[PDB]
Amino acid sequence: TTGTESETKAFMAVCIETAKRDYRTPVFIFERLCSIIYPEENEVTEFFVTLEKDPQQEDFLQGRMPGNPYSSNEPGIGPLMRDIKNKICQDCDLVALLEDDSGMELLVNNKIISLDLPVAEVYKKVWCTTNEGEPMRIVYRMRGLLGDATEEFIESLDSTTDEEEDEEEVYKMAGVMAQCGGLECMLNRLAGIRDFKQGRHLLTVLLKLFSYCVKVKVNRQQLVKLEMNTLNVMLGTLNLALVAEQESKDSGGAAVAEQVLSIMEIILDESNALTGDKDQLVMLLDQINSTFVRSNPSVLQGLLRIIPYLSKMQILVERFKPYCNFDKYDEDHSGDDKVFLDCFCKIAAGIKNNSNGHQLKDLILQKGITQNALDYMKKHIPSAKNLDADIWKKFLSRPALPFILRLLRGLAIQHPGTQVLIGTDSIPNLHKLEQVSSDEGIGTLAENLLEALREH
C-alpha cells in the first residue's frame, strides 16, 4: 500500500472494481483512502510520565507520588493536565488545592503548562521535541510560594498564529483522486447500502471520505455534475439514516444524517458559486416535524440550511400557513408555533430566484399569507407622531411583529407581486416603523423590508 498517491489511487480503482465484483469488504479500502488524503496523526498509544515535586517546595508539599513512572493509560493520568493535578492532590492528601485550579502549577521542560491542555499533546509537542522516548517529567509546585513565576506559560499547544490551513491543499490528494473517478463509485456504494444496520460502518467511512473530498474544488465541481446524480444518492442516504434513528434511537442514524446534510449544503454552495424534484423537499418537511428530528437540533439546523437550495409547494403552504396566525400568536403561541414561524420566514428569505421559486412565492401570495400579515400590521400600528409613545412601545413589543416583518421581506425579495401588494398603503407604515429603533429591531427589519421593496 505504501507508495505514491497516483499508485494509491490506482490501487483504490482496483478496490472499487473488487467491491463491484456486502458492506464490510470495501470498508478497509476507504479507510486507507482517508488515511492517504488526511493522515490522522498517530495517537501516542502509550507513554509514561513522572510526577515529581519542585525540589524548592519539598518541605511545603505533603506526601510523594509513589507510582513513578505512571502509564498514560493509568486512571487519573489525563486526558487533561488538570486530571494529573487532581490525581496529585488526591494521592498526596492536598485537599485544599483540589478545588483551587490556581493553587498548583505543573511544569514540563521548565515551562508552566495550562491545566486545560491534553496530556498526550503536551507529551508530543513539548516533551518529545527534546526527550523523545523518555518518560515525560512533570514537576508540580504551589503557585506564588517562592514569588512570581518567571517561566514561560504555555496556554495553548497549538500555534498562537491563527493562520488557517488550506483545506484545498490539505486534502489535495482528494482533488487529484477525482482523476481515478472514485467519487462516482463512492456515490454508488452510498446507494448500494440498503441495510443501515449492516452498512453503518461502510456508510460512516464513505461519509468521512466524502467530507475530505468536498474540501477540494475539483471534487466539488465534479459532484455538481447532474451525471453523478449526487443529490438523489445523498437524499436517499439521509432518509435511510433518519428512518434508522426513528426505528432505533442511538443507532448512529442522527450523526450520519447530519453528515449527509453538511455535505449536501457544501455541494449546493459550490454549485451556486444540484436541483432535484420537489418531492425531496416534502420528505425533508415531514422529517423536520418527526419527533426525532425535532429533538435533534443539529439535524434540524442542517435540514433547515439545505431546504432553501432544494427550492409539494401546496404541502409546504398547508404545513406553515397555520402558524401565520399573527393575531393569535400575540394572544398565545407554543414553542413550535414560534419555531415553525421562524422556519417559514427563513424559507421565504432563501426561496431560490427561478421559475419554480417565483411560482412558490406567487402561491404563498395567493394564500393571503402576505395579505394577512399586511392586515394585522394595519389593525395594530399606532398613528401617534411620537414613535416612543407607550402605545408605540406596546405595539413594537408584539411577538408576531418581528416574524411578520422577516416573512414579508423574504417574500418581497425578487418577487414583484408581493412588492406591489405591500407597496400599496403599507410603505408609510413601514417607513414609520423603520424610524422606531426597538429591542426587537422592528426599525431595522422595516428598513430592510423597504430596501427589498426598492427592487420594484
Side-chain angles (χ1 to χ4, degrees):
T1 46
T2 304
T4 83
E5 57 195 3
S6 178
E7 297 171 359
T8 319
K9 291 174 293 186
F11 136 106
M12 268 105 82
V14 169
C15 308
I16 296 298
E17 308 313 300
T18 329
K20 292 174 174 177
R21 280 184 270 237
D22 194 359
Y23 304 144
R24 304 173 184 180
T25 288
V27 178
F28 162 84
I29 288 144
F30 307 98
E31 288 172 357
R32 202 77 174 182
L33 225 162
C34 307
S35 307
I36 267 63
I37 300 176
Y38 191 82
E40 285 173 341
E41 290 199 330
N42 282 333
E43 284 184 340
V44 184
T45 43
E46 184 173 30
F47 60 93
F48 293 90
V49 305
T50 55
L51 306 178
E52 296 183 12
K53 293 181 178 185
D54 189 324
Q56 302 190 8
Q57 299 196 9
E58 192 72 40
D59 293 328
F60 294 99
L61 289 166
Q62 72 182 13
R64 267 186 178 193
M65 296 302 287
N68 286 327
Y70 296 88
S71 175
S72 62
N73 297 322
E74 222 173 8
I77 307 301
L80 302 179
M81 291 295 286
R82 184 176 291 115
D83 299 308
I84 298 183
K85 176 260 182 174
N86 289 340
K87 184 178 179 66
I88 292 162
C89 293
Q90 214 170 19
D91 289 353
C92 299
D93 227 8
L94 296 170
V95 190
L97 298 174
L98 209 116
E99 298 189 349
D100 185 3
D101 276 355
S102 75
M104 185 177 289
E105 293 175 338
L106 300 183
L107 297 100
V108 179
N109 283 348
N110 279 356
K111 300 186 177 214
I112 303 168
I113 309 301
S114 175
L115 298 182
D116 295 305
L117 295 178
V119 184
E121 287 217 321
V122 178
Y123 179 77
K124 194 180 181 185
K125 297 182 182 168
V126 185
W127 184 256
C128 291
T129 60
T130 48
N131 304 299
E132 193 178 12
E134 294 202 347
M136 182 170 65
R137 190 179 184 205
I138 304 176
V139 180
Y140 67 91
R141 71 181 188 194
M142 289 197 297
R143 188 175 182 181
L145 200 98
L146 295 167
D148 295 328
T150 53
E151 302 91 342
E152 188 187 341
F153 181 66
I154 302 183
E155 185 176 0
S156 173
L157 288 139
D158 304 0
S159 67
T160 64
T161 67
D162 306 301
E163 308 171 0
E164 304 178 300
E165 299 183 0
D166 186 4
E167 301 166 358
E168 298 269 355
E169 184 70 4
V170 169
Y171 303 90
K172 183 180 181 179
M173 219 302 297
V176 224
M177 187 275 314
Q179 296 188 59
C180 82
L183 296 176
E184 180 183 0
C185 180
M186 294 172 63
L187 291 166
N188 288 303
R189 297 304 147 182
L190 275 194
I193 301 177
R194 303 174 182 180
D195 187 0
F196 181 88
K197 307 176 180 179
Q198 289 183 60
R200 182 180 175 184
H201 215 56
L202 180 62
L203 223 141
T204 307
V205 175
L206 282 170
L207 292 173
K208 188 177 182 178
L209 188 62
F210 270 113
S211 74
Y212 300 164
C213 289
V214 299
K215 298 295 191 165
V216 187
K217 188 169 186 167
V218 143
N219 289 335
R220 296 193 300 260
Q221 289 204 329
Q222 187 66 12
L223 287 168
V224 167
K225 293 183 171 178
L226 303 180
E227 320 170 60
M228 311 287 292
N229 211 3
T230 306
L231 185 64
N232 298 0
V233 174
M234 289 300 178
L235 282 163
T237 305
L238 168 67
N239 200 2
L240 177 64
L242 297 174
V243 171
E245 198 69 2
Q246 291 156 359
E247 291 178 358
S248 174
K249 184 187 176 181
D250 314 301
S251 59
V256 153
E258 183 180 0
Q259 296 154 0
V260 170
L261 300 162
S262 178
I263 302 173
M264 294 181 52
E265 184 184 1
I266 299 171
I267 302 176
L268 295 157
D269 172 60
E270 172 77 3
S271 179
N272 286 245
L274 288 176
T275 57
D277 67 66
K278 299 135 194 177
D279 202 299
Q280 313 152 356
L281 193 54
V282 170
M283 165 191 59
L284 292 202
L285 306 170
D286 305 303
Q287 304 291 356
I288 143 189
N289 314 309
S290 72
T291 60
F292 143 65
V293 178
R294 288 190 175 181
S295 66
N296 195 300
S298 300
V299 176
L300 179 61
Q301 190 170 5
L303 199 102
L304 295 174
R305 283 180 179 194
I306 63 160
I307 279 169
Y309 294 109
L310 288 163
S311 80
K312 299 174 300 178
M313 301 180 175
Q314 303 179 0
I315 295 180
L316 169 80
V317 169
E318 303 292 357
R319 208 74 177 242
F320 288 89
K321 194 169 182 176
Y323 304 91
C324 304
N325 200 356
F326 304 136
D327 291 298
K328 179 183 180 180
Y329 191 90
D330 283 0
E331 306 165 1
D332 190 2
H333 64 270
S334 67
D336 301 359
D337 289 301
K338 175 173 183 179
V339 169
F340 255 88
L341 197 43
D342 166 60
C343 302
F344 189 32
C345 303
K346 293 175 170 176
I347 297 171
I351 286 179
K352 296 305 176 179
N353 191 5
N354 40 61
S355 63
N356 299 301
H358 274 271
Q359 298 156 1
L360 174 55
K361 287 200 168 186
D362 288 302
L363 172 63
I364 300 178
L365 188 75
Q366 297 155 0
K367 290 300 183 177
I369 302 181
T370 298
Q371 188 57 61
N372 189 5
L374 300 175
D375 299 357
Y376 165 102
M377 294 194 313
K378 192 173 185 178
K379 168 188 177 185
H380 308 282
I381 189 164
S383 60
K385 301 180 179 180
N386 185 5
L387 303 176
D388 315 300
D390 301 301
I391 175 179
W392 262 94
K393 295 178 170 178
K394 173 186 178 181
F395 161 78
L396 301 167
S397 60
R398 286 183 170 246
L401 193 52
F403 293 90
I404 297 164
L405 296 174
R406 300 165 44 184
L407 183 62
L408 291 181
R409 182 187 182 240
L411 293 173
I413 294 173
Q414 299 156 358
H415 187 263
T418 305
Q419 292 164 359
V420 175
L421 186 60
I422 307 179
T424 306
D425 305 0
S426 304
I427 299 299
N429 304 0
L430 304 178
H431 178 31
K432 307 162 193 173
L433 287 181
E434 103 182 301
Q435 309 171 63
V436 198
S437 177
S438 71
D439 307 300
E440 312 84 6
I442 302 310
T444 300
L445 308 172
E447 176 180 0
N448 299 359
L449 172 52
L450 287 168
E451 210 74 4
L453 298 168
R454 291 177 53 179
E455 287 169 0
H456 203 270

